[PDB]
Write a protein that binds this ligand. Structure first.
Ligand SMILES: Nc1ncnc2c1ncn2[C@@H]1O[C@H](COP(=O)(O)OP(=O)(O)OP(=O)(O)O)[C@@H](O)[C@H]1O
Lengths: 427, 408, 408
């Protein structure tokens, strides 16, 4: 579990790195401009209440729905819900279109995302005693350990004395003993007393490196999916390795081996598992079979916070014989969650956002350029205008400038056109 | 929470609020007639249909149908959507549902913990007039009696074989403390459903089942061992087969292949009471090209017995929200409940019930022991009902009506 | 043929006709910004979208994107239709496409044939300032240098390990003849794509593969051996992973399951530059019931970076057809090219390019060294463009308009 390192899809949250959380005071009322947020007071305060409902454990089989248009702070508020829940919490942003896979089933892909939303907080402090054995009999046992770069003799507690007698010991055996109720023995194992005659033996163990007394500090924050993806290999290259269509490395029997060891760490009290947040954009795209999986998922106490988002008003239920419902959510699951409405930003609110994103991205710009780009944030979507910051900075650097002006941003619209305008131009 | 049907024994005229049930006299009186129709043998192999507006205690009326049949008759809730699962055939999904409804009565020797409680994952101590003992609480046992709402001083009977805690009463505000030692093995009747016998005899579900692996699909080999043992027990006189009640919700969602199985399972002499529940006026049949009233095939509507629930009055809604307020341990001002019931008039009862838990947290941040009108008005303005949320999206999507008053 | 992007290094202002590219300044300047956006790390895991009218050098601009990134970066063309094959899963069809784009750089010892050529299935003789030798031409080698347009007297470098012929220059119309013996083994960098390593290590495709048998479906066992060896080479420092550029054409044809895989393959840190190309204004999504602009899902349009190509002017079209005329070794009169470009105004560039090869044969039958206007006017009247051919069928099918001028 120490070797297991967390691999996170940072490209999804890359557009929200400018947001630090949810800007609100002690009473609960949202601030005008805090934590990288502009406006959206009604929706900010609303989910600022749901974070408390999770903390108070009052979200008994409940979820959240973010109703609003494109670029209305939906995905942004979802990340704020995680950021406000605790430190190093799992946030899994998905889109209904991601479920629509070619090889894996509609929920074999929804399963790993649920595993990507449930984490594990580890806080294990162990006192290592590695090396050989040099027995002495006092009034309750003295053993001298020999390591690769050190030698130390220690007067063991009578608790260890009972544990060592159970697992046969002799002078010249490599051992791993722990003060925190730990007993492990390697009978006769020692590379020092190994002859070159026998090779197939493997009955000997090398002399442990460093010192005998070692203070092992384990502070690990990994999701359940990280445990599955690390135990699948028969690991640095794996962050860029996926070129295989089948993806048969993750099998149901491999997950059972993870579920049992995770349970063992909870029973010991070493590490407790912490459920996070599962965000589903394009919630209407989800099949009826997916919603019934979610209904079963929400009933489990281990389950994370299922936050959905739908840009549609009235939509046909996917997986049903054409049944129009609100946001495309079936009634069975619509009642299961509380709806939070996300309001569109007026031109005055849009330029306040631009200045925050430019400051984070590292793009210097004139006051007049912010006004021109905000005009595109109201005529077209908020995502399109925000995308104009990076090409205009290159166009300015090329012209020798650091400050981006109207002339530089005018070319950005000419070169990089939105999906709506690009279609109409072709006629 | 639900005590029974809440009806008169002789006249069969239902009380406005009795036996854990509130309102819906017309439906509850019709429910009482159906029970009597089966008992006399007048209705044989006929399904029930609770039609009506959403959140009109449709589950509660069917829960009342159960308790009014026998002392320990099995009752199971099944939503039609839950049948269409990614892993588990809709045949197995329906077989599990029917087996969850049919139970067996066997007299067994098992120890029952009887005595007064002195309350504190945790540790709850018990006491009798002769002996005193401390008991470490099991993770599943905590969740079992919190649903029962067991408080300190209550006299309870815990059957260790089933795990069910039964509230016998209280010593002080009454029933007196039991004499002898706590654990006593007696010949008690055990009623365990066919599906539960399958899940007991089959492979134990490992921790985090929804994390990965196949569903609760019971092997045909295991089910065979149970069926043959139950059949051997029927002949011996050891077991008594008791047909419970299956409650099917969202019935409009059922396929034509489901109704053919329901009638095939209903064909049996030991079939359960199949209660259907439709929240729709007019809905098309799935699998069939044709349309029908509640989404039932042309053949089912004539066989079924239809009962209709009605919309709750502000006075009927008044206590429902207050009962749910006490259950969720919240304290409201008379003005706040009046406002919460006023929400329940235009918007659903379920939406108004959601505003109860949300307003408590806003009142907790204000540091008040009374949840008021300004606390409820907040939840309504923060969290939107389905009809208002869709309205909000529709206007944001396309401005249907302009400032001039001109459309398009 | 294509030399590069044809843009200025400092100002990034594109020249009208430079580096094997003609016109489309707006798109080429936008292409140059995208390349700089990736280099600075500003754009991370973002696809490109070359939208515009058909035959507007969409492949050529993306070909320019490649050569302007690195010296030997892999570039592969994929039409969305080619994915839907009768034999080969559309997953394998897309995996092959992505593996064709990712390459590995290894410094290898291999012999390179350097020297002047004296030209003649055939036999081409080579010469150096010290030695002379005759070499029998291989069937695949003939097809390799004819695409390079290698003429007699040219100074060339043939790497025997890869088989690629590289034109270093010429001795007479300049670079002088190499000193020593032809074959010299040097430490040269080899850039072979992941898919090519799979096809090299896997079973060799027999003569006439399209005649019968399974497609180039590489076994999961073989691909595993390559992936593990590449991973072992990355750690050793032997290989350097270089992410090339994947060009996807007819994007409107892609299913919802394709876009989910594209984003999954794009998720990687070593992912290639995915360039999409749509020739449509408004087109519905396949697999999804909803409609969209270029046929991309509601989630892809916001992530993608759109670039637009424009219709070529008669002066822009003037040289394109003349470049293609020289490539196909045809000689036209100034009046004929003016007529051929006039065809390219109302009808497509591709249709006008087809009229070049057809007019040559009619001019060959007339026994003339100059292809004229009457030679081009023939091809236009013999062979019809899509819009004219459909017009021809529609009138023959049903006479939509009568002699009177009355419809129906
Ligand atoms: N209130 C806000 N304050 C600061 N930035 C905001 C605010 N609202 C939206 N944004 C920013 O707008 C940019 C693009 O919008 P984004 O893709 O997040 O839309 P969304 O509404 O959050 O989700 P969806 O994709 O469902 O519309 C993001 O960088 C986001 O953080």
């Amino acid at each position: 579990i120490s070797e297991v390192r967390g691999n996170t899809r940072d490209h999804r949250t890359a557009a929200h790195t400018h947001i630090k959380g949810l800007g609100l005071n002690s009473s609960g009322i949202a601030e005008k401009q805090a934590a990288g947020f502009v406006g959206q007071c009604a929706a900010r305060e609303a989910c600022g209440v749901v974070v408390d409902l999770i903390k108070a454990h009052k979200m008994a089989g409940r979820g959240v729905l973010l109703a609003g248009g494109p670029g209305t702070g939906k995905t942004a508020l979802a990340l704020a819900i995680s950021q406000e829940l605790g430190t190093k919490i799992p946030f899994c942003p998905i889109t209904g279109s991601e479920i629509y896979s070619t090889e894996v089933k509609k929920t074999e892909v929804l399963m790993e995302n649920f595993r990507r939303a449930i984490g594990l907080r580890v806080r294990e402090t162990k006192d290592v005693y590695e090396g050989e054995v040099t027995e002495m009999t006092p009034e309750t046992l003295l053993i001298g350990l020999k390591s690769a770069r050190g030698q130390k003799k220690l007067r063991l507690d009578p608790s260890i004395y009972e544990a060592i007698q159970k697992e046969r010991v002799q002078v010249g055996d490599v051992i791993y003993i722990e003060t925190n109720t730990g007993a492990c023995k390697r009978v006769g194992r020692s590379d020092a007393y190994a002859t070159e005659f026998d090779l197939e033996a493997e009955e000997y163990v090398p002399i442990p490196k460093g010192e005998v007394h070692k203070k092992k500090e384990i502070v690990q924050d990994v999701t359940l999916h990280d445990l599955d993806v690390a135990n699948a290999r028969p690991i640095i290259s794996m962050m860029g390795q996926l070129m295989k269509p089948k993806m048969t490395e993750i099998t149901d029997k491999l997950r059972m081996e993870i579920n049992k060891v995770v349970q063992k760490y909870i029973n010991q009290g070493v590490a407790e598992l912490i459920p996070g947040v599962l965000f589903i954009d394009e919630a209407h795209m989800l099949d009826i079979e997916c919603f019934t999986y979610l209904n079963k998922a929400l009933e489990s106490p281990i389950a994370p916070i299922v936050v959905l988002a739908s840009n549609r008003g009235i939509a046909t239920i996917r997986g049903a014989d054409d049944l129009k419902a609100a946001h495309g959510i079936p009634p069975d699951f619509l009642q299961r969650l509380l709806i939070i409405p996300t309001h569109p930003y007026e031109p005055d609110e849009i330029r306040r956002i631009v200045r925050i994103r430019a400051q984070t991205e590292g793009v210097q710009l004139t006051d007049a350029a912010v006004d021109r780009v905000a005009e595109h944030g109201v005529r077209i979507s908020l995502r399109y205008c925000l995308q104009l910051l990076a090409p205009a900075s290159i166009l300015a650097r090329v012209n020798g400038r650091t400050q981006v002006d109207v002339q530089d941003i005018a070319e950005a619209e000419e070169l990089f056109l939105d999906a709506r305008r690009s279609a109409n131009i072709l006629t | 929470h639900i005590r029974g049907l809440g009806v008169d024994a002789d006249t069969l005229e239902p009380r406005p609020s009795s036996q854990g049930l509130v309102g819906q006299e017309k439906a509850r009186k019709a429910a009482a007639v159906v029970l009597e129709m089966i008992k006399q043998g007048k209705i044989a192999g006929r399904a029930v249909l609770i039609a009506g507006p959403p959140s009109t205690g449709k589950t509660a009326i069917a829960m009342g149908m159960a308790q009014s049949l026998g002392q320990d008759v099995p009752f199971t809730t099944l939503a039609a959507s839950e049948i269409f699962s990614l892993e588990m055939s809709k045949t197995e999904a329906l077989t599990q549902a029917f087996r969850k409804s049919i139970g067996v009565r066997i007299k067994e020797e098992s120890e029952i913990m009887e005595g007064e409680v002195v309350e504190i994952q945790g540790k709850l101590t018990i006491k009798t007039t002769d002996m005193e003992a401390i008991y470490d609480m099991g993770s599943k046992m905590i969740d079992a009696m919190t649903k029962e709402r067991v408080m300190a001083g209550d006299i309870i009977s815990i059957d260790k074989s089933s795990g069910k805690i039964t509230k016998l009463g209280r010593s002080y505000a009454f029933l007196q403390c039991p004499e002898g030692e706590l654990q006593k093995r007696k010949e008690v009747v055990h009623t365990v459903s066919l599906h539960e016998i399958d899940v007991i005899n089959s492979r134990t579900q490992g921790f985090l089942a929804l994390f990965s692996g196949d569903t609760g699909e019971i092997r045909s080999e295991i089910r065979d061992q149970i069926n043959t043992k139950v059949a051997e027990w029927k002949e011996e006189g050891k077991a008594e087969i008791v047909p419970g009640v299956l409650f099917i919700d969202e019935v409009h969602m059922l396929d034509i292949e489901c109704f053919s199985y329901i009638n095939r399972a209903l064909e049996s002499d030991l079939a359960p009471i199949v209660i259907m529940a439709s929240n729709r006026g007019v809905s098309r049949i799935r699998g069939t090209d044709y349309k029908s009233p509640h989404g039932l095939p042309l053949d089912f509507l004539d066989r079924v017995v239809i009962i209709n629930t009605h919309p709750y009055t502000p006075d009927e809604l008044r206590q429902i929200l207050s009962i749910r307020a006490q259950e969720e341990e919240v304290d409201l001002t008379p003005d706040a409940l009046a406002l919460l019931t006023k929400i329940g008039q235009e918007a659903g009862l379920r939406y108004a019930s959601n505003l109860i838990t949300t307003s408590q947290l806003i009142a907790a941040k204000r540091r008040a022991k009374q949840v008021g009108v300004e606390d409820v008005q907040r939840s309504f303005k923060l969290f939107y009902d389905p009809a208002r949320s869709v309205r909000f999206v529709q206007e944001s999507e396309k401005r249907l009506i302009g400032n001039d008053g001109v459309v398009d």
